[PDB]
Write a protein that binds this ligand. Structure first.
Ligand SMILES: C[N+](C)(C)CCOP(=O)(O)O
Ligand SMILES: C[N+](C)(C)CCOP(=O)(O)O
Length: 178
């Protein structure tokens, strides 16, 4: 199912699937469709999303096996408030460590831009404001620049992902063995 909250075969993840998910959110000024393909060799178990800005009405997909991708979404808080969708998703991996993913889709593009990041944290660590600060300010996040970026994560893993630049945002990440 190309529906937020679903887990799909990981080879099925791509821009078309995420655009469907994004569109299905409707007319909201700032929104995101997130897809993350687990090709890490270990099962992932959802912990939480820390929403610095915005909300989601989707259950964070609980179990994501190797060879599956998760689909997710978020959107700005409702009403005229001039805020975006910003947060960190945290999954526990079966080795006892944490996969964290930052997204930032800001309201005001005169000052801010789209960013994303991926990091592995040692141990089981829920997403929170400190994790957000680290990933957004200190751990060299990638711009949502309509381009692909790759980086090693340690722990025998690497990441490759893409985010666009606008307020109707797609974030596609693949986690693979190094
Ligand atoms: C990410 N940020 C909070 C530093 C700026 C953009 O967030 P927002 O105020 O538009 O929600
Ligand atoms: C994300 N960053 C803090 C590394 C660079 C600043 O980007 P922004 O908050 O001005 O968009």
């Amino acid at each position: 199912a190309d529906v937020a909250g679903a887990v799909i075969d990981g080879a099925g993840l791509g821009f078309d699937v995420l655009k469907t998910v994004l569109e299905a959110l409707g007319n909201v000024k700032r929104k995101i469709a997130v897809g993350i393909d687990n090709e890490s060799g270990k099962t992932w178990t959802a912990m939480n999303t820390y929403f610095r800005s915005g909300t989601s009405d989707i259950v964070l997909p609980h179990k994501v096996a190797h060879g599956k991708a998760l689909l997710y979404n978020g959107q700005k808080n409702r009403g005229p408030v001039a805020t975006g969708v910003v947060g960190v998703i945290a999954y526990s991996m079966s080795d006892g460590n944490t996969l964290a993913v930052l997204f930032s889709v800001p309201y005001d593009y005169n000052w801010y831009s789209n960013w994303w990041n991926v990091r592995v944290y040692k141990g089981q660590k829920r997403a929170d404001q400190r994790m957000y600060e680290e990933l957004y300010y200190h751990r060299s996040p990638f711009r949502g620049d309509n381009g692909w970026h790759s980086r090693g994560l340690g722990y025998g893993l690497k990441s490759r992902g893409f985010m666009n630049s606008s307020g109707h945002a797609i974030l596609e990440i693949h986690v693979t063995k190094a």
